[model samples]
Target: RGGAGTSQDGTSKNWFKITIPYGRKYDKAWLLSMIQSKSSVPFTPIEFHYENTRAQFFVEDASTASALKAVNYKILDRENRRISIIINSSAPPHTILNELKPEQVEQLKLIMSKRYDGSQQALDLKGLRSDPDLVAQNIDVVLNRRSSMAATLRIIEENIPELLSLNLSNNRLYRLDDMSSIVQKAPNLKILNLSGNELKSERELDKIKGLKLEELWLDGNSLSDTFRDQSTYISAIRERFPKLLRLDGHELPPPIAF
Candidate 1:
C-alpha cells in the first residue's frame, strides 16, 4: 500500500505517492483480478459495485468496501453491508486485468471464492476475500458488458424480486439487440444507466417490461453522442420514461432544458 494512510489534518487527506511499493502495474492487475472473479459471486440480497475507467461493476458483500479506490474505482458496502465496486477503464480487452499466466491465474483464484444459490439465507458470502464492508439485501446493478444484462435477468428470475438501479454504459451494445428477455425478468429496476452503449436509435428501450425508476444515469452512453447537440436524446428519455423523476445528463432529443 504505497498509498499514504489516512491523514490527521483537519482537511481529511490521504494521498498515494507517485507510485506503490510493487508499482502501478501490479496494482492495476490486483484490482483487475478481483473484479474478473466476480462471476463466482452467488445469489444473496446484496449490492456489489465494481467501478473502473468509465464503467462501474457492482456486487454484494458488505464487509469489504474500502478495498475499492481509484479515479473512479470504488468499493461500497451499504448500511446493510452490500458489496460494490466501481471503476472507469478505457483500455482494450481485459483492460482492467492484464494477461495472466496459467499458474498466475490459478494462484489468484485461491484468494477468490464462489457462492451459489443453494444457501438458505439471503446472502451467505461468508468467506469472499474482500474489505468486509460491502453487503446489502436488495440491489440494482448496471454492468458495461451487454451480455452482463443476462446476469441481471438471472438475478430477478432465479433469486430476488427487487432491483433499484442498473448501469450498462460504455460497451458494445446495439439497438437491434433483444431486450425481451430482460423485460420479462427485472420489471422493478428504478434507475437504469445505458449511456455509451450503441442503442440510441433502438425503440426497444421503450419496451422495458416493468419499472419504477425515479432517477436515471445516462451521461456517457451512445445516446449522449447521437443527440449530444440536439434535443432528440432528451426527448427520447422523456418518452422512454415519462414518469422519470430526475435524470443525469443533458436533455435527450434536445430543444428544452434538462
Candidate 2:
C-alpha cells in the first residue's frame, strides 16, 4: 500500500526521517502552532532505513493525509543523492513547515531500542538476528542504533568488513574521532548516513580521508560548528575529500571537496 505500512516504526526497507532543524528562530506562537499541527500525523521514525537517500512519506491517518496534501513533496535523486522537500507543508524550503512538535523531534534523535526476554536490549537486535541471509547477501546496514551497535561493529569488522553502504543516522554516539575508527574498519563503505546527529564540530570530519566513500549524510545536526570559512574544519574536509558528495545539513547538500 502507498500508505502507512503495518508499523510506524519502519521495517527493514522503510526509510524514515523527521524534517526538522534542531534550533531555529521561532516565537512561542510558532512553536505552539507547530506542536499543534503535529499533535494531530503519526510518524515517530522508529526502527527504519532507506536505500542510500530515499525518504519514505507514508500517509498514516487523516491528519497526516491532509498534511501531505496541504503540502507537496517532490522527491529527487541527483546521481546518488535523494532530496526531500515539502512543497505542501508550512515551511519555506520544506513543503510542510510548523507541522511537527519538539517532542517528535526528540523522538527522532534517539536510537531505536528493543527488548529481548529479560534483557533491556533486544537479543536479535536491529532485525539482524533472525536473518543470517541479510548479513551474507544484503549490502545495506540500518543503524538508528538498529541493526548495528558498537559490539556489532567488531562483528561486521570480522564478518562482512566490506559492505558497500551504511546508514548510521539519529544517534548521539558519534564522537569527533569516531570517523577515523570507521574509516579504518569499513574500508569499502561507499554510502554513510550521519544525518540527524548534528556532528558537534567540523573538527571530526578532519580525520576522515583516503576513504573511497562517495556519499555522506551530515544533515539535521548542529552545523554551527561547520561553515565555509577557511579556518573551519568543515571547509577543510570539503577541500580534502575531492570525491565527496552530499554533505547536507543547513539547507541542501554540497560537495565536500568539489
Candidate 3:
C-alpha cells in the first residue's frame, strides 16, 4: 500500500510545508542543513519556493512527519532579529494538558483503564501517541514530555500502584529524570520495556535505578549500540538493575560475585 506516494497522484500525506519570514537570510541550503542536523527523521525536500519563502519535505510516514513537525527552534540573525522555523502538518499537534479539567481527567482515566491488564498487573502504553481515542481528543500522553509523563505517572500511582510490568516503548524518551520516582509508585515493577527510544547512554538508566527489573527491553535504543562488547553492555545494565535476568530478550548468566 506504500509505494513512494504514487497511489495518490504524486502527492503524499507525509509532505510537510516549512515557512520562514526572511527566506534570503535563511535560504534553502541553510534550512536544509538545520533540518538535517536537528530532526532525527530522514526526509526528502520535494519543493522549494524561494519567492514565497516556503519549502515542502516528504518524510517516510505520517508519524515521521508528526515528529518532524514537533521540531522547534529559534535563531538570532546579525541585526538581532529573532528568526523561528515553522512546520505545517495535516495532523495538529497533540494537546498538552497543563491543568487537567474534570472531564479530561475522566477521559484519561478511561484511557488508562483500557491500557491496564488487572490479572497481569501490567500496563501497555507503547505507541500511545497514535491511539485512536487520544488522537480524536488531540490528547498527548507521550511519556517523553515531562508534564505528560508526570500526569500519567500520578494517575498510575493513584490507581495502579501494584503494577509489575510496564511497556513504555516507542515513546521517543531520551531522558528519564521525570520518571525517576516510578519505583516509589510501582514498587513491584520487575518487567520494563523501554525499546525504540532515544536514550543515548547507560546513565539515563540510573534515573530509575531503584527498580529491580527482571526483564528489560533496550533493543531499539541508541544506548544499546554504544557498547563494544556484550559483557560490557550487560555489566552496565546490571549496575542499574542488579536482579536483571533478561535483557533485550536474551537470558543472561548469573551475575559474577567477588
Candidate 4:
C-alpha cells in the first residue's frame, strides 16, 4: 500500500504509461510483447489505452511497476532498426467498475432497457462499457469479470428469459465460465454474436454447449485463427453448436445425421 492511496481519483494511481515516438510504425502486439519479455516482473497490463504515440495501462502491484521502470527502452525490429520506448506512471481514459454493487444493479437494468429489442426478443449488450449513461457515471462494465457478467446475466434471466438473440460482441470476453448458465437462462436463444472478443480456444465454446444456437458469430476472436482451414473451422464449431446454420453470417451446409 506504499503508493496506493496517493491519488484523489482511486482509479488513476496504479496505471503505467508507455510512449514510443514512432509507435505507428510498429505493430502494437510486437511492442507489447517486447516490453513484457524484457521486464523481470511477471505481470500483464489491464485496461490498455493506446493513442498516436502513447499507451497507458494498469498494473496490479508496485513490484511490477518498479520492474517495468527499469526495463531497457531501446527495442530492435525485424529489420534491426532501433526504436525508443518510454514507460512511466499515467492515468486511464475511463473509470473501470470491477464489480456491480447492490444499488448499481438497478442502474445497469436501466442501461440494459435501451439495448433490449422487445419485439425481436433480443438483447444487444455489445460494447456495454461505452453506454453513454454508464460512461456518464464514470462506470465501465467489463463482462469478462465474473461479478459483472453474473449481474448482467441475472437481469437477463429475470427480465427476459424468453430472449431469442443476444449480441455480446466486443465485450473482451476471453473466458466463458460465468456465462455457462446462459443455456438454461435463455432456453430459446437462437442467434448469439460473440465477435470481436478475445476468446482463444475451442474449449471455451464447450462451456455454452447446451444452447441450440441457430446463428453464431465468432469472427475477430483468436480462436477463429486457430483453425487450419475454413472447412475444419466449420466442422469444429458445428460439433459444439450442432444446430448452428449460420456462422459469421455465412450459411452453412446442414448438419449430417444418421
For all predicted structures, in order, the TM-scores are 0.37, 0.36, 0.60, 0.61
**Local accuracy of candidate 1 as per-residue lDDT tens digits, 58-176:** 32222122233321223222233323333222222232643332332332232222332223222222222222322231111223233334443454455544544444445455653
How do the residues 10-120 of candidate 3 rate in per-residue lDDT, one tens digit apiece? 556444555554656666677667665666676666545553333444344666655555555544456777656566653222224264533466668777789889888
User: What are the per-residue Cα lDDT tens digits for candidate 2 across 1-258?
Assistant: 435544434422332233422212234234324433544343332222232232322222334435433323222222433233221222112234322233422222222222111221122233332334344533233332322344345444554456555555555544544345667676777656656664676556666655665766665666644465523534555554656665553332454332
Model 4 weakest 10-residue run by lDDT: 89-98
Query: Deviation in angstroms for 99 in model 2?
Result: 40
Q: 245, model 2: CA deviation in Å?
A: 2.8
Winning candidate number (lDDT): 4
Error of 3 at 9 (Å): 56
Q: All candidates: CA RMSD in angstroms?
A: 20.7, 21.9, 17.2, 18.2
| Pairs that collide, model 3 | none
lDDT (Cα, 0-100) at 114 in candidate 4: 91
TM-score of 4: 0.61
- Tens-digit lDDT track for model 4 on 1-258? 335645565643565555555656666687778767777867876766565455556665656766766665556777777666566565553455457654578778877889889999778888987667788765667788888888888989999889999899988878899888988898998889889888889788899888898889998899887889889999898888887888887778887878
Model 2: CA > 4 A from native: 1-149, 224-235, 249-258
Rank by TM-score, descending? Answer: 4, 3, 1, 2
Show where candidate 3 strays beyond 4 Å.
Answer: 1-102
Report lDDT (CA) for all predictions.
0.40, 0.42, 0.72, 0.77
TM-score of 2: 0.36
Instruction: Say which candidate scores most in TM-score.
Output: 4
